[PDB]
């Protein structure tokens, strides 16, 4: 196995993260969510930045999904404030601000993510299955 850095993880193919007990799993998930939103990483980055309605997060417990949605919303607001101010008090937010070259487009994308946070695609397993059965009902054959 290898060590995991949230700002150097290649988001290509299949990756297996083993988060031990007590580790910051919800923080690493929020960091990877901001990385997928802003499109950071350089050579190991995504080929294109994605919106809020294109990032799928699957967690079993509904309260865990609500807590993760609230934490990602708070992280989006804090990163938008730190990008408007060009300064922060967090070292991971400092490296996130150091990774980007442009500030106005990133701030506009974070504002659009804050406004589209209600339509975020962070659902459970059975909720995602019901949504995919009700959406494409023709190929599946669902009422």
């Amino acid at each position: 196995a290898e060590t995991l850095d949230p700002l150097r993880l290649p988001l290509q193919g299949e990756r297996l993260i083993e988060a031990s007990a007590g580790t910051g799993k919800t923080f690493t998930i929020a960091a990877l969510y901001l990385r997928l939103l802003l499109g950071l990483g350089g050579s190991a980055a995504f080929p294109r930045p994605l919106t809020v309605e294109e990032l799928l997060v699957v967690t079993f417990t509904e309260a865990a999904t609500a807590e993760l949605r609230g934490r990602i919303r708070s992280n989006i607001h804090e990163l938008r404030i730190a990008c408007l101010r060009e300064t922060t008090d967090n070292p991971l937010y400092e490296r996130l601000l150091e990774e980007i070259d442009d500030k106005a487009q990133a701030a506009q994308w974070l504002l659009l993510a804050e406004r589209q946070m209600d339509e975020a695609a962070v659902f459970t397993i059975h909720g995602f299955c019901q949504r995919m059965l009700n959406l494409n009902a023709f190929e599946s054959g669902m009422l």
Binding site: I81, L84, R85, E86
Partner: protein
Amino acid sequence: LLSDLESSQELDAFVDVTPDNLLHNIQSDILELENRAVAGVNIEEFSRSDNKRPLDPLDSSITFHVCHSPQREVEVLHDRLLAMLEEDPTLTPRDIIVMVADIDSYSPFIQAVFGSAPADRYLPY
């Protein structure tokens, strides 16, 4: 879509609101189309805080409440409406409206906390 009409006659009758309360401040900021949110691009704007608008501690226009259950929420709401009726001598319950996101979920609790009041405490709903 309204501005695209050719033969439209546009008349404006806007009554300005004097910004004294917090709700009147928000309505004046919406009507006048201005940005009062301080981002703090520099450290001088981030250090000082008197550049914002002063909010009086007795201004009870906009309040946000955190509750634990749909029963306790409307039980707090009934006491707060009684306090608002006691605070102002000229206040009609017809001028008070309560809007819920889902009526069928909260309406049993609303009827329960509105029927249990005694004759000196009962307000019509």
